Each structure stands twice: as C-alpha cells, then as structure tokens.
Amino acid sequence: SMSVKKPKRDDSKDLALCSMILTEMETHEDAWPFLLPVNLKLVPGYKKVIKKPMDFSTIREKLSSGQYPNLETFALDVRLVFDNCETFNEDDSDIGRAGHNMRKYFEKKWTDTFK
C-alpha cells in the first residue's frame, strides 16, 4: 500500500530472456502453423470465430517495439496462440497436435527460466 513495498524482484533481464524463449519457439519444427498470421481472406470461419488472432511474428514485433509492459502480458499472447489453435482445430489433426506440443514446450521453458 502507500509507502509499503514488497521487495524488488529483478526484472532487468526479462526482455532478453523472453526474446530467447521466443527464438526457441520460432525454430521448433512444429512451429509452422504459428509463424505468420492466419490469412483471414482464405480460411473460412477464422475471422468470425477467433476474436483475437495471434501468431509468433506478431509477438516478435510487439516485443521488439516496447508493446509488452511486463513478462506476464508476453506469456498471455503466447498462450493465446495455443488457445486459438485448440478452438479451431481437432486434437487429432497435425495442427492440433502441433499446438499441444508447442504449449508443453513453452510452459517448461517458462518454468525453468522464471519459476
């Protein structure tokens, strides 16, 4: 509260570390469904169904231009990529499986790096 602060967690490496994690996700073999925005002119249903599209390229631009205020807002966008994937794709499809594998990969790097 006013004039009563919890001790300062060092956040000065967060930017560099989120960039490393993002590089690792970009270079994973199962990243291919997620590298670029889904083409909303060519994929029926996507525009109407998926209220907040997100992809790795869009996260990379936001990170590079100071659009994440902290590491939690970065993790929210990464999870949104996988949540959207589960919404639109059957678990037993190549893309549905890619999404489960990538979420698992992310969540381990997140815990090992920060928790």
Separation between Cα atoms, residue 29 and residue 39, nearest integer Å: 21
CB 15 within 8 A of CB 42: no
> DSSP readout, 47-102?
HHH-SS---HHHHHHHHHTT--SSHHHHHHHHHHHHHHHHHHS-TTSHHHHHHHHH
Both tokens assigned to 112: 């090992």
Q: Give me the sign of the Cα torsion angle 85, 88, 92, 94.
A: negative
CB 40 within 8 A of CB 46: yes
Stated in angstroms to one decimal place, the resolution of this structure is 1.9
Tally Cβ neighbours within 10 Å of residue 53: 14
The closest alpha carbon to 79, from 95, 57, 59, 61, belongs to 59
CATH architecture for segment(s) 1-115: Up-down Bundle (1.20)
Q: Where are the domains of the chain?
A: 1-115
Both tokens assigned to 7: 């001790």
Burial of 46 (0-12, 13-18, 19+ CB in 10 A): middle
